[PDB]
Design a binder for this molecule. Structure first.
Ligand SMILES: *[C@@H]1O[C@H](CO)[C@@H](O[C@@H]2O[C@H](CO)[C@@H](O[C@@H]3O[C@H](CO)[C@@H](O)[C@H](O)[C@@H]3O)[C@H](O)[C@H]2NC(C)=O)[C@H](O)[C@H]1NC(C)=O
Ligand SMILES: OC[C@H]1O[C@@H](O[C@@H]2[C@H](O)[C@@H](O)[C@H](O)O[C@@H]2CO)[C@H](O)[C@@H](O)[C@H]1O
Ligand SMILES: [Ca+2]
Ligand SMILES: [Ca+2]
Ligand SMILES: [Ca+2]
Ligand SMILES: [Ca+2]
Length: 334
């Protein structure tokens, strides 16, 4: 098995608030984290926002959710969006209150944030396994100061964030991840790290794990073969372990906006499809020297079945009954 077989279920507490509830494989209502834990899912990924208006995905939200993850027996991976809202390669909005004008000041705010996110978690007695300094930061983070016009700035902000983690009172220090999208592209992956490390503002010893996203429905170049190479090259070149931290496969996709990659076009859009996909992905990752795991993105997000894609349903739960699909078991045995 993979060391880590996970899911990001950040939406859970918001969805429980609206009324919703989940059924296990045997038709009995049960808390989603216990259902998942029972399937072999050993790790839960959670997105963190800094000061969202309505408190979605804030620190308090995450402590509430992480207690339940801890209780259930699973490890915790915090995905620091380092923003008040969605962070991705086309939106990296600096948190309100943080500097859009002074790097010296933004670095301090970031150090303080990671330090004290960590110290609060240590205070509430919750262990953190993985913390990412940004979500999908290939186009940088904390705009404008960390836009890709300044890899020197990005490198320096990462160093600040990492150092807040190291300096916290966590009994065990979380493994620090840098997370880029387009995991399949070695040129994208390598370009970021060589350019940033070349500056000398990020040190190789500032972080522990590579994270990558790997989605099949945003470009026909996302071949399993291209991912195998990207992952192997990241590891050979920089001597660090690699994790696929976000992936989906549709159980229904009638109007894709992009051709699926050539080595995945024979996989159906069904629950069985999801399993075959996850198995083929897991094999790539098992065979990568030091390939530690796979996390599915938002398997249970009722009312957002498309999960942002041009595909109709990417969930691992039946949204007509709120019952989890068998694909959850395949995820847990990867
Ligand atoms: C540095 O980072 C923290 C983390 O976001 C910023 O928010 C402040 O966090 C501290 C530490 O958790 C809070 O203080 C603590 O509050 C609890 C409950 O009231 C109390 O039991 C602890 O003993 C401690 O006082 C603080 O309230 C919170 N502040 C805000 C405005 O939310 C902090 O502000 C950052 N620092 C700067 C100077 O920007
Ligand atoms: O509700 C959809 C939501 O998707 C967000 O993006 C997620 C994820 O956070 C990213 O890390 C990844 O690149 O893509 C997925 C969507 O497939 C997005 O940031 C939001 O704007 C929403 O569309
Ligand atoms: Ca609640
Ligand atoms: Ca069974
Ligand atoms: Ca079980
Ligand atoms: Ca730009």
């Amino acid at each position: 098995a993979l060391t880590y077989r996970g899911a990001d279920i950040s939406s859970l507490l918001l969805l429980e608030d609206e009324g919703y509830s989940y059924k296990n494989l045997n038709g009995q209502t049960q808390a989603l984290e216990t259902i998942l834990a029972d399937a072999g899912i050993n790790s839960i990924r959670q997105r963190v926002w800094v000061n969202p208006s309505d408190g979605s995905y804030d620190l308090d939200y995450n402590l509430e959710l992480a207690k339940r993850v801890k209780a259930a027996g699973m490890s915790l991976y915090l995905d620091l969006h380092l923003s008040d809202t969605w962070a991705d390669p086309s939106d990296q909005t600096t948190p309100s209150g943080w500097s859009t004008t002074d790097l010296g000041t933004l670095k301090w705010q970031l150090y303080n944030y990671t330090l004290e996110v960590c110290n609060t978690f240590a205070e509430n007695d919750i262990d953190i396994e993985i913390i990412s300094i940004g979500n999908e930061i290939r186009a940088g983070l904390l705009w404008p100061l960390g836009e890709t016009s300044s890899y020197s700035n990005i490198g320096a902000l990462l160093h600040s964030g990492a150092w807040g983690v190291k300096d916290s009172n966590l009994a065990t220090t979380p493994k620090i991840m840098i997370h880029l999208d387009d995991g399949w592209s070695w040129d994208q992956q390598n370009y970021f790290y060589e350019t940033v490390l070349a500056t000398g503002e990020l040190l190789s010893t500032d972080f522990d794990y590579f994270g990558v996203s790997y989605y099949p429905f945003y470009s026909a170049s996302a071949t399993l073969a291209s991912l195998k190479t990207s992952l192997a090259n990241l590891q050979s070149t920089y001597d660090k372990p690699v994790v696929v931290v976000e992936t989906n496969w549709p159980v229904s996709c009638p109007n894709p906006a992009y051709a699926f990659p050539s080595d995945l076009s024979s996989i159906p859009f069904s629950v069985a499809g999801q399993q075959e996909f996850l198995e083929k992905l897991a094999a790539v990752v098992e065979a990568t020297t030091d390939g530690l795991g796979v996390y599915y993105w938002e398997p249970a997000w009722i009312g957002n079945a498309g999960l942002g894609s041009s595909c109709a349903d990417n969930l691992m739960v039946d949204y007509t009954t709120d019952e989890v699909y068998e694909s959850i078991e395949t995820l847990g045995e990867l």
